[PDB]
Every structure is written in structure tokens, then in C-alpha cells.
């Protein structure tokens, strides 16, 4: 894969959260596992510099932008650079969804990165009202408890002035009054929800020495200790899954319900298993597409080919599927194969009748013409009629694959065409 | 005059706090006042207050994301007021030609007069209990988090949502508007009879009423 300019993944226009289909195509193409890192921060904290120097390089649409670039310190894996552009620009556009953009940047990424310019005073905390709504904005089980299961590692970044600051800087004070109660909600969440936490600092690049290397340390940290986006026990997210998650979360927001973590995984399983069926079906029309040539000699042969190919395609289902709880897909696959069988059997019977009647016509119509003219009413034609009919039946069966319904129809010919032989013997 | 503006602006510069970018603010003020610039933005300066004398001709004031407490007297020529995410307690009288009032995440207690030229307006994330009559052409209103008690009367395209409030009442004045209004009033502890009263009311020829989301 190769992108030179980051494009919009979720635009935030006309008071609506919409996905970008052209950018979802690029996701559905990248089949390599992903390490997702967002860059959340206010509208002009210089958000870009942490992307160009992260992907490795050198008046827009607001929302979440992405940049896919190969992982510079990993094989196979591919890191994704999310970035909330225009976050908080009260002047430019609607702000009903800044909390939504925050929640989505949490749910999609694997290492959440805030980017404030201040000194984490009370102002920089009042500019972080998004985190006080995470318990009101994101469900996790169709409660705010299992958040540490999938929540990313916090990496704060102060762009003008390390972890010594942050470790004690979120030490909430004890109390019970309402005045100190509001002071807990931000710091309570940043500590309890996110598994690993951090902090960084960056000197100003004006009026550089301890900045390029200062940011090089942070970039090396992100390159080194970043972890692959996991869902529920492994399952390294990889393109198509990220697209499924984006679509699920957005179609949940623009529908009413909350972005669920369980449902966004159940639908992903029921779509990545909805491909296992159409994969095991193609492996059935392909194998039994040149292993069967109707009509067949016997029936045990066709049933022996089925019983083989069925449990051979069931293997293809197992090899590319997971979480078929209650075994709902591993029976809509079987019921879709038994119908194929019951149809193949009737198709074979009809294809047997076809060739039987065709050979009937081809071989016996000469005799029909001969007796139709009267070349056998001569006083001596009964014996030669017997000769030709017996040897012609001898030339009937020495014709491979006449179908199981072989002579069953043939007797309908002889039994209904005996008055000819009757009159011939009478005319002898 | 003009040189008298520089006096009060250079006098605010001194009466500031440690982490209060006032030199940049004064530089922006002199950058606007001299070029006769219509726009003036004091984006992110950790300001605890503003000077008493803004330029008397601006049409756009963006003083959001600060630690303000009360705005100075806005110039009459103002047409857009973007003052959100700071700590306001009351709004000085709005200029008569105002067209956009964007003030959220503050601590407003009540709203003063609203001129007839307010097109859009966002007062969400505050502590308001009552609102004056919304102007004739007020298009979008966001009061998504306050302490409202009763829905305001409109003085007849419209789209206001009063999410997350303690209002819980719909009189006739709502059901007298045509099928162009949109009043999302979700997350409200509405009356037990008014809860399905809307259901059996909306399941009727309600093409002489408004859309009501809850």
C-alpha cells in the first residue's frame, strides 16, 4: 500500500457524522494487521507535525482524517495515523460531535494521543470535557467497567514548555462536596480507564536543538512500544475489520443507539463468517463441477462424491471463520448443501431420461422406418426382424452411462411396441 | 481616537497573571485596529479578562477558549460573537445587528435581549433557567445542557433542540407551528400523561404541527 497525502475518513459537515466511501475502499484493500494511533487535540495545536514526522515525510474538511503508511519498525504490520482536524473550531462548524469524534478516536485507535498546548492547568482540563461523557457515550456490553479491556494507552503531549508531571498531576484530592466532585471526573477517567499512560513535552521551534531530537524520542517511543489493535482476545485488526467497525459505529451514531463494543464485534463476526459460506460454496461448485458428469453409472457413486465434497467444504468454513455461537452459520451452510444434493439427484434422473429417449430415437428409428415401409412383411422377415432387434438391443446397452433410470423407460418402448411383432408373426 | 486605544491596551498588559499571554493579545489588537480589519480573534490566550475598549468597527469577535468572567461592551458594528468554552457569568447587551451568538461551556445564568437579526445561536453547556422570546428568524438553537423549566414562545426553516433539560412540558404554542419546525426535546423528565399524549397525537393528521423528537 502507498498513500502520499492523508485523506478524510469521517467528515463532520451539515450537522452529521458521515463516513467517506472512497477512503473506506482503501481500508477494505489493506489486508495487513494494523496499529492505530490517533492525534486528538484542539483545532490549531499544530496537529500536522505529529503526522508528517510519524509517517516519515520531509481551510479544509473537519473531522477524523487517516494516513496509512507501512510500519517503519515492524514486518507485515501497518500503522494508521488518525487525526482530529478542526476539533473545537467553534467558528467554523457544528460542535455537536466533538464528543463523538473523541469517542470514535478512542474506539478505533490502539494508542490514544492527546495534544494540548497549555500546562495541564484547570483550563486544559476544562478543554477536555469529552472524557467526562465516555461513560455516557460508549457502551461496552450490549457499564463503565471493562473499558481497560480495549481502551488505548494514553499519551499526552504538551507542545510548549516529563512523565513525572503526569504521574502525580492527576492525583485527585479527597472529599465529598460538589465543588471537588467535578474535579474528579476528568482525572478519575484518564487514570482508571486507560491501561498504560504517559506524557511528553516539546520546546518551541522559534527564537532547533532540543525539539527535533526531543520529538525524535517521542516518535521512537511510538514506533517501538505501539501495539496492534485488538478486539476481544487477539484478532489483530486489519483493514476490512476497521471498515466494518467504522461503519458500525457511524451507523449507530446517525441512528440513535450508542456505539457498542459487543455488537460491533458480533456483526463483524457474522460478516466475516458470511464470507466463509460463500467461500465453502465456491469450493463445492468447483470440486463437484468437474468430478460429476451426468448421467452416472450408479447412485452410490454420486452420494460418495457428495459425502466427500460436503465435509471437504466444511473444512473451508472452519479455516476462515470464528464465533459461530449457537452454531447458526454451520447449519445454514449444511441446509444449503443438502438442497444441492436433493436437486442433483432429480437433475441426474432427468438427465438419464433425456439420454435414454435420445438413444431410443437414434437407434430404433431405422427399425421404425423399415417396418414402416414394409420390408419385413415378406414371407421370411420375422427371423431377420428377430436378428436385427436382438442385435440392436445388444448395440443399445454397450453405450456407457445411460443413467440409473436406464432400461426402466426402455420397457415402455417394447411393451407398447409389440403389436408390430404380433402382425409380423401373423404375416409370416 | 486611536492613540488613546493604545493606552488602555498597554495598561491591561501589566495587570495580568503569570501564564496569561497578554503581549500577543495586544499585538493582535494593534494588528486589527490599524489595518481597519473587520475580524479580530483572541483564540487561545488563557485570558482572565478583556480590556474595556475593543475596536469600534469589528464585525467578528472570537474570544473563546479562555478563563473570562464578563465581556466588555461589544461594539455596535459586531455581527458574530464567538465566545465559548470560557467561564462567563452574564452577557453584556448584544449589538442590534448581531447575527450569530456562539457561547457554550460557560456558566451563564440568564440571557439578555436578543435582536431580530439572530440567525444561529448556541447556548449549550450552561446554567440557564429562562429564555426570552426567540426572534422572528432564529434558525438554529442549541440549549443541549441547561436547567430550563418551560419551553420558550416563538414569535412567528426552524430547528432548535433542547436536549438534556428539566423542562418536561409542551403547551399549545408548540402545536400551533406548521410542519417546518423541529423540536428535539429528548432526555427530559416529561409528564406521565404528556408522554403518550404526544404518541396518540402524532399518530393523527399532524401536518399542522412540528416534528418532536424525544
Numbering used by the authors:
A (entry chain A): 5 to 62, 73 to 156, 167 to 185, 198 to 243, 259 to 479
B (entry chain B): 22 to 177, 183 to 240
Give the exact sentences the study uses for this entry:
The guanylate-binding proteins (GBPs) play critical roles in cell-autonomous immunity against a diverse range of bacterial, viral, and protozoan pathogens. GBP1 contains an N-terminal large GTPase (LG) domain and a C-terminal helical region, which can be further divided into a middle domain (MD) that contains the α7-α11 helices and a GTPase effector domain (GED) that consists of the α12-α13 helices. The GED folds back and interacts with LG and MD, which is important to maintain GBP1 at the resting state. Recent studies have discovered that IpaH9.8 ubiquitinates and degrades a subset of GBPs, which is important for S. flexneri to suppress host defense and replicate in the cells.
We subsequently crystallized the LG-MD region of GBP1 (GBP1LG-MD) in complex with IpaH9.8LRR and determined the structure at 3.6 Å. In the complex structure, it engages GBP1LG using the concave surface of the solenoid. Three regions in GBP1LG are involved in interacting with IpaH9.8LRR: the P-loop, the switch II region, and the α3 helix. On the other hand, these regions are involved in forming the dimer interface in the LG dimer structure, and therefore binding of IpaH9.8 would lead to the disruption of the GBP1LG dimer. In the structure, seven out of the eight LRR modules in IpaH9.8LRR contribute residues to interact with GBP1. The residues involved in binding GBP1 are unique to IpaH9.8, explaining the fact that only IpaH9.8, but not other IpaH proteins, specifically degrades the GBPs. In our structure, since the GED domain is not present, the MD domain is free to adopt a relaxed conformation. The α7 helix, which is forced to bend in the apo structure due to the interaction between the GED and the LG-MD domains, springs back to the straightened state. Starting from a highly conserved Gln321, the C-terminal half of the α7 helix rotates ~13°, and this conformational change is transmitted toward the rest of the protein, causing an ~20° en bloc rotation of the α8-α11 helices. In contrast, the GBP1LG-MD structure likely reflects GBP1 at its most relaxed state.
